[PDB]
């Protein structure tokens, strides 16, 4: 079985600039001057769409800023003058032999200027506490880039293993992200502590921002 | 006008069998290889096998042989993939895709979500996300709903019956160690009109026929 | 229609 | 009631000196010999020497002469033991004890731990101890936390904020060649409770003001 | 100086049975009818407590199940009907001369029926691996008696010099022990091998028990 | 108020 490895896994590039994505095959897929490697583009909620056939032949309707190159084991997809509609995940596919295999995909995202998150904390509702669980939510709104560190503190003890993060896709209008971090505790654990805090570190913040509440005042 | 239309989302317990359909239109179904390609997070794209509907010839990925059966009905122009002995690693979106003589996949179906889990159908609990107290030093406030412990996907969330869409973030669900899903939906609103304007999240979990409207406010 | 599937390895030698 | 109350734990660097105190109450301090005794692992109990506070007379074990000075302050009914030029092998518990005419040690202080080390204060790193996978076959599962690379002793570990005590084993710390300590704390629980109940270790290292809570589970 | 040698070093006696502890002096410590030998009891976290003066005289408050005997070079402490509170280390002390010296101690523990360990292995966490070290932990839970052999294998190579053991004191409820063995490797060493195993030998097991995992499957 | 310490070696004969 042929293994296709793409690089990088993800890439942020500014509008109007040039993106380069690579695919390396575990064996040569070229013979007789033809390379049996193809490129697909996929946007969320949609199937992949064939973009380039035989390493360098653009499909009909693909704009000229797209190109492909390479031979043997190493292939490259290049997009100059990036347009908003170009940001997507790209996959390589060989047609050397059975079975057909695909690269793991490269996600191309929009690089924009740094934007600091707006941070909010939410206590658990009395309704949820009735059922025996406490969810504490920390919201980071409209930030760039994606990298952010959210640290929960409960009476100054640093938490681990009891929170989960979820992140939106890049906003269609401002290209920012938003993120939720949810700390989940038993009601028993929750009632044993007073100060609930989430501390947010991000490139756009000169120093970390902490939002907190005291249990029993909400 | 090549169109590939797949059957709907499916939920299965481990050890069961799933059978996805793909209805084709606008080409000689009997003359083109039909492939099965599945997509799960972090697992790229996986080519399951293929069938040539004309004579029923098949080629399988050895990773799946003896566990997947690909079939084709010429009268109904429909291809099928049975994945037997399903396991929690077979949760994925399953696509059908027409390919041509140069072995590229040029037309794709819309995909079929297949969830495999030992969990049972359960509608969400909906809890408010509201600040401990109303701030009067900030010109905006965030409000939200926590949509917790439901199965299976999906749920839909709107605000104010669709009249509030600006600034809404509805996060992707996360799978908890319980086997149930959870997500939050948040919105930013003006402080100056709080306590005169209402903000209500509208949650619909069609698999359990559950709908909840939750009015959110600080106590 | 057409059943042909051109696979690169089929264009090598020896067959 | 006779009571001997000693000074608290000491952490010292090699080459330094330490002066341990022993405050006597409930009897006439000047009328009884006051002794000092060392207890280190692997060396049992060792008598260091004694002082008669009435006149300051002393008798020393020759093994300790030239490195220990025993003194007494009649005005505050306190005896003292000063260890000079400390070495790692002076790490031990030191006791004061009153003796009587029959040369038994009838009342003892509570002990003073003296740790001699070149290490510096450092809080631990805490890591989960969770099985590679959650086994089916066994009805009992173990979880834990590894509390690694701290100095000095002690750390405290509890589970579920003190609510879980049954089946917990917190092991004695081991001194690594780095001069830092490490220990693990484990708990055994019903396998059926995994995923439906949370297990969190609570680690406190007071010398470094390090506090962490870690919920432990496999992937 | 006088050397006091106690026998045995560790003694396990069933509840309600008799325990006998011996102390041999390197010279006689008896003269004129006096025996200058005394006995102390020590529990963890506490100073020793004088129990018997001049070989056979119980201190006030000491239960009558304690008795001492002997003369010359040989002295005996006997407990006629072991109670749970008698679990302690016992020391003899002479008063023949300065310097006073003590026996090395006899640790008296509760004998119970044989219990096989439950064995568990834990891989290193991804968080620790980030830092360049891998700790692998083997747990032996709730076994009796204390002797147990734990050997580490890495790709079937016996490990030496890179593990440390720690054992609990006897449990107050079930009189068992538990033991941890920790194998510490550099991340570089850890990533060059696949199978990590701890092998436990104990009299309660019909044959050695191995618990293992393969790196990168957790 | 008694400094005396009775040690066995001191009871030996001859003294």
Author numbering:
A (entry chain C), E (entry chain A): 1 to 218
B (entry chain D), D (entry chain B): 1 to 219
C (entry chain F), F (entry chain E): 1 to 15
Task: Recite the paper's sentences.
An important factor involved in pathogenic angiogenesis is leucine-rich α-2-glycoprotein 1 (LRG1), the antibody blockade of which has been shown to lead to a reduction in both choroidal neovascularization and tumor growth in mouse models. LRG1 belongs to the leucine-rich repeat family of proteins, many of which are involved in protein–protein interactions and cell-signaling pathways. When studying disordered vascularization in mice following laser-induced choroidal neovascularization (CNV) and oxygen-induced retinopathy, Wang et al. further revealed that LRG1 gene deletion or blockade with an anti-LRG1 antibody resulted in a significant reduction in lesion size. These experiments, together with recent reports that LRG1 is involved in tumor growth, tumor metastasis and emphysema, indicate that LRG1 affects vascular stability and may be a suitable therapeutic target in multiple pathologies associated with aberrant vascularization and vascular destabilization. In this work, we have determined the high-resolution crystal structure of the Fab fragment of Magacizumab (MagaFab), the lead IgG4 humanized from 15C4, in complex with a 15-amino-acid peptide that corresponds to the epitope in LRG1.
